[PDB]
Amino acid sequence: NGPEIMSKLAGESESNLRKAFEEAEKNAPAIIFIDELDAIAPKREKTHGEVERRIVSQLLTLMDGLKQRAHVIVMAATNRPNSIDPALRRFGRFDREVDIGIPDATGRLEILQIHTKNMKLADDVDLEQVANET
Amino acid sequence: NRPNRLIVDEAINEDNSVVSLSQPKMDELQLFRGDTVLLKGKKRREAVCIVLSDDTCSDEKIRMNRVVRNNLRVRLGDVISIQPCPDVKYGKRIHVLPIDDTVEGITGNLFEVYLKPYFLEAYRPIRKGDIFLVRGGMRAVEFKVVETDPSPYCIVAPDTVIHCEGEPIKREDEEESLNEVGYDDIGGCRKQLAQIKEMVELPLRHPALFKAIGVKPPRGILLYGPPGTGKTLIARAVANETGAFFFLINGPEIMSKLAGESESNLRKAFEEAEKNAPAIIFIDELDAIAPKREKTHGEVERRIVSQLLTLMDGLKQRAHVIVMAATNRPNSIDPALRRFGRFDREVDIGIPDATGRLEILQIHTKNMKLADDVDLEQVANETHGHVGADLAALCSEAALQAIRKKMDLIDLEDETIDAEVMNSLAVTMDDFRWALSQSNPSALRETVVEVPQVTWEDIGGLEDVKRELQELVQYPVEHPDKFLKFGMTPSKGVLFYGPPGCGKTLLAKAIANECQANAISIKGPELLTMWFGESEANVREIFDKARQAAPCVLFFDELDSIAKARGGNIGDGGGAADRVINQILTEMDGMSTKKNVFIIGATNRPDIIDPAILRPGRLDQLIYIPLPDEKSRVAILKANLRKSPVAKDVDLEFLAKMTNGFSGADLTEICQRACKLAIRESIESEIRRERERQTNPSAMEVEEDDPVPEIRRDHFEEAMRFARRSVSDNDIRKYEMFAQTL
């Protein structure tokens, strides 16, 4: 979690990051997930603290090292591709990008079905209209 | 003086145990190509190889590759001996063994598949100690001759036995790893690699010579280019091809620490490089360490920049260490480094061409299997905007596209996948097309400098302008001295004025193709983008690129676009000046003649162009491009139709005579319309044919005939209905008036 790293000091933060990477490597084949990546590594124009720039380089070194060792895979979640640094979007760190976009009427209907399983419904539901109106 | 020894050089023939020398030195050695010859080298080792001769190679150069050099303990520029080997013997069982960690993760009867086809029909002259190599099934493995039943060297008989056993062993520290790179592992950077090699071959192969003369070598080099182009790869290849010690530094690894650790690591790096002289230092992501002071706020950043400057200054006094740095653009970093003594020498890598992309594909397709359908020429043509890594990824992706569902399901239960089934799979072009269309994150949109392919034959007629053009460009370079004898100074600019669609853009590239020089083209939308964005500084960059790509040609079209934007031809109240042409004139006037950078402009409304750009100097010469005539229209039609299949009932001269006041594009559009009609007719006919007989359950009904492989006068005469004039006669009268009032 991004904030959990930003809510500490340099030593603790850059020890937890490394320790997480070692733990992921030890339990291979494993997966690492990161969210709120913007909170950690935005473009340098928005960064002023020296510690903030000292926390991005560590991540780049770890990503470069990953290629040599183990089967670990890394996945990150962001709001928009341009919100983060362009140095991560290179060959060997975050080459692959994917979009989730937004569900359609069929997707909304499916989500309603998922969320209405254990619930009891009457005969007047007609979820199609709700999906159209949603 | 004893022409026994000889110099080393690259090898063209990739087959091992093979060489290539010049034609004349046959009696100089008294032997033929088929003759087998032993070749000497240090640590008291000599290897046998077959012979062959070429012509392009000088009489003083041997041709040989990485593996033979490895089993001879040699590098380029060195020298060895030679002696023919008519005393060869046909060797029976000669025990071998696969000696590497390449073994790791292998299975199957590699013996047969890998070796029997290699030694097949080979008669490979083999001598003990050889470390010969072979590639197959996405991998590349090597074997060493441990014993030769007859010794030391022997022919291999297609009948000789190979009872192949033994387990992997270790490579002594003497020889290096197969993975180590070389000049043969890169393509598309032939010009740059030549510059670097010629620049840094003396200080490392001949340092005592530098100590013997008073001259200042370079002790700092900068390379700029987009990411994924092969800069660190080039550095490591150069280091491996000379034996000089190599050391690496990573920008983030320094910024991921505190001041003391960072500024201790840098000093220790420099000290180790000095102690291991002759050595090379490489730095990447230099912008991450030393950007311009405007972007730095932390004091420690300035401290590390100052430390780097001081260490660069201190390098000059001590040792033979060389420093190389990699960046994206020259202006991204501080200007204090670009001085005399720190980073004086600079280099561009740019982008590979179709040939370079083809070479990269060949490099990355060695171990991978392939099929007949696959051709690397068409793929290179459809891979614009791809640099290095991209292609590699593509390759891998394509391979997986074949493996994933078919092989996984088959092997899931049948048996633990072995080498035989693993390498049995080939690759198909449909897989390449899938990997190309689906995964096409082209990573580049910047300008491209390269030699075009258009030729005079592509253009129709216009011979006199060809003669007038060769004089302005060819004669200077072919015969510079002639001008010195007289008092002439060649002009550097020309301007084309005329109606649209008359091949003005084609000449600028035909000239470059004839002269084999780089070409750059900037379109009007870019000029308007700079005008609205009020960014005239970019102009300078363009010229710098041309300055570094000389000899080259510069092209500007839609030069009247700005004048048309602000008001009509007369314009608004303002005059005929603007913010961009002023910068262009400022750059042109302050340019040297010896750089050989020609300038071409093009337009169709010279009336409103600023006169200041046509004064003696600058763009003094003007040429008029008229509408194609009958004899030119036939040539244009033939040139446009030399690519598509056509019938013979056509009468091209009849159509050309029928056309008057037409443009070159006015005929290409007719060709495309007729081709579209043919495609539509074929589609409808084929779909109807497939649909009709499906109801009729005839298991076999194949009257297979190309419904319309070629087009007739019907489609063309249909197309002439929509084919009409484009340029008004009044416009031609205006052009002639402007061409006569001069």
Ligand SMILES: Nc1ncnc2c1ncn2[C@@H]1O[C@H](COP(=O)(O)OP(=O)(O)O)[C@@H](O)[C@H]1O
């Ligand atoms: N000219 C080239 N020929 C072959 N491979 C290349 C070339 N340029 C880049 N590559 C590929 O790029 C990868 C290395 O990228 P690198 O050169 O480190 O990126 P950068 O240019 O940003 O330093 C290698 O795996 C290599 O296969």
Ligand SMILES: Nc1ncnc2c1ncn2[C@@H]1O[C@H](COP(=O)(O)OP(=O)(O)O)[C@@H](O)[C@H]1O
């Ligand atoms: N002399 C010519 N011979 C063959 N094709 C021509 C000729 N002139 C124009 N064309 C056609 O016109 C197109 C290029 O148009 P161009 O003449 O560059 O326009 P502009 O004059 O605005 O630069 C090409 O596709 C080409 O087929």
